[PDB]
């Protein structure tokens, strides 16, 4: 069973990583469990997804949002690398053309109340929940 401090330690391994690593199967399981625990200790999450193609990005969006318990929409696509935002507080969701060099998912966990998590983690793997 995973403690909050353990979960944070796991996620903090990705602190300031611009490009998410390719993780082994059991590493992914640990990161999944850590992320799910931590997000229960926050009121909502905002996702920022950078991917080489719309398809990879949209797959990340659909799989993360499901594991986090969020409903999602169809976003129109663009050619080339993409950035996708999914705002869990106000429902904002969009896909843009992305000219940057990061890859993976940033998960901003926000809480209205002190004691709650107010941290951003990643970049975490696009395929973390695949």
C-beta of 2: minimal distance to Cl ion in Å? 20
**Closer by beta carbon to Cl ion, 12 or else 97:** 12
Taking alpha carbons only, the member of 104, 113, 112, 130 closest to residue 47 is 104
Q: Tell me whether residue 54 or residue 125 sits nearer to Cl ion (CB atom).
A: 125
Contact letters for Cl ion, residues 1-40 (x by CB under 5 A): --------------x-------------------------
Angle between helices 4-12 and 25-40 (to 10 degrees): 120
Partner residues linked to 104 by β-bridges: 50
Q: Which residues bind Cl ion (CB under 5 A)?
A: 15
């Amino acid at each position: 069973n995973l403690t909050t401090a353990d979960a944070k330690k796991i996620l903090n391994k990705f602190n300031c990583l611009d490009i998410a690593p390719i993780l082994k199967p059991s590493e992914k399981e640990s990161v999944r469990r850590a992320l799910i625990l931590i997000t229960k200790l926050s009121d909502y999450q905002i996702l920022g997804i950078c991917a080489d193609t719309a398809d990879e990005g949209l797959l990340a969006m659909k799989t993360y949002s499901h594991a986090l318990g969020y409903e999602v929409p169809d976003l129109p696509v663009v050619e080339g690398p993409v950035y996708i935002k999914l705002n869990g507080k106000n429902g904002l969701c969009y896909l843009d053309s992305y000219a940057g060099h990061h890859r993976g998912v940033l998960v901003s966990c926000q809480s209205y109340y002190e004691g709650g998590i107010n941290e951003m983690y990643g970049h975490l793997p696009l395929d973390l929940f695949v």
